[PDB]
Design a protein around this motif. Sequence first.
Motif, PDB file in Angstrom:
ATOM      1  N   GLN A 179       7.709  -6.263 -15.725  1.00 50.22           N
ATOM      2  CA  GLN A 179       7.549  -5.977 -17.138  1.00 50.22           C
ATOM      3  C   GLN A 179       6.644  -6.993 -17.819  1.00 50.22           C
ATOM      4  OE1 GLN A 179      10.635  -7.202 -19.945  1.00 50.22           O
ATOM      5  NE2 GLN A 179      11.065  -5.038 -20.228  1.00 50.22           N
ATOM      6  N   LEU A 180       5.740  -6.506 -18.655  1.00 46.74           N
ATOM      7  CA  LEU A 180       4.981  -7.362 -19.543  1.00 46.74           C
ATOM      8  C   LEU A 180       5.936  -7.825 -20.645  1.00 46.74           C
ATOM      9  CD1 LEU A 180       2.089  -8.474 -20.057  1.00 46.74           C
ATOM     10  CD2 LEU A 180       1.854  -6.468 -21.607  1.00 46.74           C
ATOM     11  N   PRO A 181       6.156  -9.152 -20.784  1.00 49.53           N
ATOM     12  CA  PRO A 181       7.261  -9.607 -21.651  1.00 49.53           C
ATOM     13  C   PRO A 181       7.212  -9.068 -23.091  1.00 49.53           C
ATOM     14  CG  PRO A 181       6.450 -11.414 -20.329  1.00 49.53           C
ATOM     15  CD  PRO A 181       5.479 -10.292 -20.137  1.00 49.53           C
ATOM     16  N   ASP A 182       8.360  -8.596 -23.568  1.00 50.98           N
ATOM     17  CA  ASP A 182       8.546  -8.103 -24.940  1.00 50.98           C
ATOM     18  C   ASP A 182       7.896  -6.762 -25.183  1.00 50.98           C
ATOM     19  OD1 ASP A 182       9.873 -10.532 -25.818  1.00 50.98           O
ATOM     20  OD2 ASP A 182       7.869 -11.459 -25.907  1.00 50.98           O
ATOM     21  N   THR A 183       7.649  -6.014 -24.114  1.00 52.36           N
ATOM     22  CA  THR A 183       7.054  -4.696 -24.240  1.00 52.36           C
ATOM     23  C   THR A 183       7.787  -3.739 -23.360  1.00 52.36           C
ATOM     24  OG1 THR A 183       5.564  -4.854 -22.382  1.00 52.36           O
ATOM     25  CG2 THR A 183       4.761  -5.768 -24.505  1.00 52.36           C
ATOM     26  N   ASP A 184       7.346  -2.485 -23.370  1.00 53.83           N
ATOM     27  CA  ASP A 184       7.841  -1.483 -22.436  1.00 53.83           C
ATOM     28  C   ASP A 184       6.752  -1.126 -21.447  1.00 53.83           C
ATOM     29  OD1 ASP A 184       6.056   0.143 -23.781  1.00 53.83           O
ATOM     30  OD2 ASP A 184       7.562   1.461 -24.639  1.00 53.83           O
ATOM     31  N   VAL A 185       5.908  -2.096 -21.149  1.00 56.56           N
ATOM     32  CA  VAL A 185       4.794  -1.891 -20.236  1.00 56.56           C
ATOM     33  C   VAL A 185       5.188  -2.449 -18.887  1.00 56.56           C
ATOM     34  CG1 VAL A 185       2.328  -2.491 -19.810  1.00 56.56           C
ATOM     35  CG2 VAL A 185       3.136  -1.874 -22.121  1.00 56.56           C
ATOM     36  N   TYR A 186       5.105  -1.595 -17.871  1.00 51.92           N
ATOM     37  CA  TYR A 186       5.454  -2.003 -16.514  1.00 51.92           C
ATOM     38  C   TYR A 186       4.258  -1.842 -15.620  1.00 51.92           C
ATOM     39  CZ  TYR A 186      10.122  -1.870 -18.392  1.00 51.92           C
ATOM     40  OH  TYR A 186      11.225  -2.114 -19.119  1.00 51.92           O
ATOM     41  N   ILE A 187       3.878  -2.919 -14.922  1.00 49.70           N
ATOM     42  CA  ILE A 187       2.718  -2.870 -14.027  1.00 49.70           C
ATOM     43  C   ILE A 187       2.920  -3.739 -12.779  1.00 49.70           C
ATOM     44  CG2 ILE A 187       1.178  -2.391 -16.007  1.00 49.70           C
ATOM     45  CD1 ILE A 187       0.124  -5.244 -15.810  1.00 49.70           C
ATOM     46  N   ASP A 188       2.048  -3.541 -11.787  1.00 48.97           N
ATOM     47  CA  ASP A 188       1.929  -4.400 -10.628  1.00 48.97           C
ATOM     48  C   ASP A 188       2.218  -5.843 -11.012  1.00 48.97           C
ATOM     49  OD1 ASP A 188       1.149  -5.710  -8.232  1.00 48.97           O
ATOM     50  OD2 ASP A 188      -0.409  -4.166  -7.866  1.00 48.97           O
ATOM     51  N   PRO A 223       0.806  -1.220   0.000  1.00 43.86           N
ATOM     52  CA  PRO A 223       0.000   0.000   0.000  1.00 43.86           C
ATOM     53  C   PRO A 223       0.832   1.259   0.000  1.00 43.86           C
ATOM     54  CG  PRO A 223       0.056  -0.857   2.194  1.00 43.86           C
ATOM     55  CD  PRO A 223       0.788  -1.868   1.324  1.00 43.86           C
ATOM     56  N   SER A 224       2.013   1.282   0.610  1.00 39.50           N
ATOM     57  CA  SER A 224       2.840   2.482   0.430  1.00 39.50           C
ATOM     58  C   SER A 224       3.767   2.365  -0.819  1.00 39.50           C
ATOM     59  CB  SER A 224       3.652   2.777   1.697  1.00 39.50           C
ATOM     60  OG  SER A 224       4.684   1.836   1.845  1.00 39.50           O
ATOM     61  N   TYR A 225       3.959   1.154  -1.338  1.00 48.07           N
ATOM     62  CA  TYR A 225       4.717   0.964  -2.585  1.00 48.07           C
ATOM     63  C   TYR A 225       4.134  -0.253  -3.266  1.00 48.07           C
ATOM     64  CZ  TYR A 225       7.043  -2.974  -0.308  1.00 48.07           C
ATOM     65  OH  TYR A 225       7.303  -4.170   0.315  1.00 48.07           O
ATOM     66  N   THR A 226       4.274  -0.335  -4.585  1.00 47.84           N
ATOM     67  CA  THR A 226       3.953  -1.534  -5.346  1.00 47.84           C
ATOM     68  C   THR A 226       5.185  -2.047  -6.135  1.00 47.84           C
ATOM     69  OG1 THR A 226       1.720  -0.668  -5.678  1.00 47.84           O
ATOM     70  CG2 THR A 226       2.373  -2.541  -7.052  1.00 47.84           C
ATOM     71  N   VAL A 227       5.465  -3.343  -6.094  1.00 46.00           N
ATOM     72  CA  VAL A 227       6.525  -3.892  -6.944  1.00 46.00           C
ATOM     73  C   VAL A 227       6.015  -4.035  -8.360  1.00 46.00           C
ATOM     74  CG1 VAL A 227       8.099  -5.772  -7.387  1.00 46.00           C
ATOM     75  CG2 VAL A 227       7.486  -5.091  -5.012  1.00 46.00           C
ATOM     76  N   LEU A 228       6.763  -3.492  -9.304  1.00 42.95           N
ATOM     77  CA  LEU A 228       6.402  -3.589 -10.709  1.00 42.95           C
ATOM     78  C   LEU A 228       7.239  -4.620 -11.417  1.00 42.95           C
ATOM     79  CD1 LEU A 228       5.994   0.187 -11.751  1.00 42.95           C
ATOM     80  CD2 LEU A 228       4.374  -1.302 -10.413  1.00 42.95           C
ATOM     81  N   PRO A 255      15.613  -9.532 -13.936  1.00 42.72           N
ATOM     82  CA  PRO A 255      16.806  -9.909 -13.176  1.00 42.72           C
ATOM     83  C   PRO A 255      17.790  -8.759 -13.031  1.00 42.72           C
ATOM     84  CG  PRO A 255      16.327 -11.577 -14.803  1.00 42.72           C
ATOM     85  CD  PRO A 255      15.370 -10.458 -15.056  1.00 42.72           C
ATOM     86  N   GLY A 256      18.215  -8.460 -11.801  1.00 38.27           N
ATOM     87  CA  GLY A 256      19.204  -7.425 -11.539  1.00 38.27           C
ATOM     88  C   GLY A 256      18.621  -6.044 -11.250  1.00 38.27           C
ATOM     89  N   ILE A 257      17.304  -5.936 -11.384  1.00 36.78           N
ATOM     90  CA  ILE A 257      16.596  -4.656 -11.283  1.00 36.78           C
ATOM     91  C   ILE A 257      15.370  -4.803 -10.379  1.00 36.78           C
ATOM     92  CG2 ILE A 257      15.370  -2.808 -12.567  1.00 36.78           C
ATOM     93  CD1 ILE A 257      16.837  -3.498 -15.085  1.00 36.78           C
ATOM     94  N   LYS A 258      15.223  -3.898  -9.424  1.00 40.48           N
ATOM     95  CA  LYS A 258      13.978  -3.783  -8.676  1.00 40.48           C
ATOM     96  C   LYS A 258      13.265  -2.506  -9.047  1.00 40.48           C
ATOM     97  CE  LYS A 258      12.656  -6.175  -6.025  1.00 40.48           C
ATOM     98  NZ  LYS A 258      11.968  -7.504  -6.003  1.00 40.48           N
ATOM     99  N   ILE A 259      11.958  -2.623  -9.275  1.00 41.81           N
ATOM    100  CA  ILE A 259      11.148  -1.487  -9.649  1.00 41.81           C
ATOM    101  C   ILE A 259      10.025  -1.338  -8.646  1.00 41.81           C
ATOM    102  CG2 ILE A 259       9.875  -0.354 -11.510  1.00 41.81           C
ATOM    103  CD1 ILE A 259      11.140  -2.431 -13.455  1.00 41.81           C
ATOM    104  N   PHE A 260      10.079  -0.248  -7.895  1.00 46.37           N
ATOM    105  CA  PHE A 260       9.053   0.066  -6.919  1.00 46.37           C
ATOM    106  C   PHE A 260       8.314   1.298  -7.362  1.00 46.37           C
ATOM    107  CE2 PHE A 260      12.659  -1.587  -4.399  1.00 46.37           C
ATOM    108  CZ  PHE A 260      12.111  -2.797  -4.087  1.00 46.37           C
ATOM    109  N   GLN A 261       6.996   1.193  -7.398  1.00 47.66           N
ATOM    110  CA  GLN A 261       6.148   2.345  -7.588  1.00 47.66           C
ATOM    111  C   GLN A 261       5.829   2.920  -6.220  1.00 47.66           C
ATOM    112  OE1 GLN A 261       1.844   1.977  -8.607  1.00 47.66           O
ATOM    113  NE2 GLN A 261       2.524   2.719 -10.588  1.00 47.66           N
ATOM    114  N   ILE A 262       6.085   4.206  -6.059  1.00 45.86           N
ATOM    115  CA  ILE A 262       5.823   4.908  -4.812  1.00 45.86           C
ATOM    116  C   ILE A 262       4.320   5.236  -4.753  1.00 45.86           C
ATOM    117  CG2 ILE A 262       6.247   7.051  -3.522  1.00 45.86           C
ATOM    118  CD1 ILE A 262       8.891   7.175  -4.988  1.00 45.86           C
TER     119      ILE A 262
END
Length: 129
Positions: free
Chosen positions: A8-17, A1-6, A28-35
């Motif tokens: 990638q939708l494979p083979d796209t530039d779409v990043y979501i929950d 609720p204070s952050y969401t882990v994002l 791999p090697g990357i963490k993506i947090f939505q604030i």
Amino acid sequence: PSYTVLGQLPDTDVYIDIDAYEEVKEIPGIKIFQINAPIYYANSDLYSNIHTVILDFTQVNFMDSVGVKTLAGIVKEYGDVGIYVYLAGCSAQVVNDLTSNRFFENPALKELLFHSIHDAVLGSQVREA
């Protein structure tokens, strides 16, 4: 609720929950947090093999001094172990908030800013170690 882990939708530039759709996968090697809440709230949640952390600021409309200081501490401590923290999707206002609270006292931190998550991902691909 204070952050969401994002992820990638494979083979796209779409990043979501990561939890919104089964095939979305982290990189791999990357963490993506939505604030999703002021970053000091999400920070206390974090305190509880990665080369890059990407913070998605698209939902942030402004930052306060405490937030900027928190952010600056996050960037520094990760940085001290070779991990880059990138900021994706900061609005003009958020960049003004960062700037006025002396976050770019060192103008090199300007290089942590990216327009989109995908831009930030591509920026981690090859860089001075």
